[PDB]
Paper text:
The NMB0736 gene of Neisseria meningitidis serogroup B strain MC58 encodes the putative nitrogen regulatory protein, IIANtr (abbreviated to NM-IIANtr).
The structure of NM-IIANtr consists of a 5-stranded mixed β-sheet which is sandwiched by six α-helices, two on one side and four on the other. The overall fold, as expected from the sequence homology, is similar to that of E. coli IIANtr (34 % sequence identity) and IIAmtl (23% sequence identity). The active site of NM-IIANtr is located in a concave area of protein surface consisting of α3–α4 and β2–β3. The active site residue, H67, the equivalent of H73 in E. coli IIANtr or H65 in E. coli IIAmtl, is the fifth residue of β3 and is surrounded by hydrophobic residues L69, I65, L114, L117 and A121 on one side, and by hydrophilic residues R51 and R69 on the other side. Interestingly, in our structure there is also a strong peak of electron density located on the 2-fold crystallographic axis, which could be modelled as a sulphate ion interacting with the side-chains of R51, H67 and R69 via salt bridge/hydrogen bonding, as well as to the equivalent residues of the symmetry related molecule.
Residue numbers in the entry: 2 to 147
């Protein structure tokens, strides 16, 4: 529901050429920059402070990098489809091509676990991951993710 107001078409990338996970994270800071009240450097540190604890990869080419910060007052996200898979240090050893990033304010945690939990559910389905890997438009991506 709120996933829709959090993922506009302007926050979706369909064919990003990226070589490293570090690179992927830098590009994310840029996408979520300022519209989150934070500089891309701060958005980056926030996502990496968490990735530090361990890979946010869910297994099977999917991942959900995320972070919280007192400066964020409204949840915001983005979706990335890589041209080539990226070594994500995932739980099953396979690289990732589908990345959903989420930046949340530091307040309504419980509600956030909901968004993450629901998303993971969608990603656990083979046919959903297969669609996200073939659809041509960003609108199709949104339709599937919602």
């Amino acid at each position: 529901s709120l996933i829709g107001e959090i993922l506009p078409l302007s926050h979706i990338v369909l064919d990003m050429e990226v070589g490293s996970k570090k690179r992927l994270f830098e590009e994310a800071g840029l996408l979520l920059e300022r519209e989150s009240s934070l500089s891309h450097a701060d958005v980056f540190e926030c996502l990496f402070a968490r990735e530090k604890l361990g890979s946010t990869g869910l297994g099977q080419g999917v991942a959900i990098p995320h972070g919280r910060h007192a400066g964020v007052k409204q949840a915001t996200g983005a979706f990335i489809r890589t041209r080539e898979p990226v070594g994500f240090d995932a739980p099953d050893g396979k690289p990732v091509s589908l990345i959903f990033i989420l930046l949340v304010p530091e307040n309504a945690t419980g509600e956030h676990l909901e968004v993450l939990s629901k998303l993971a559910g969608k990603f656990s389905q083979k046919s959903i991951r297969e669609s996200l890997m073939t659809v041509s438009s960003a609108e199709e991506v949104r339709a599937i993710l919602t």
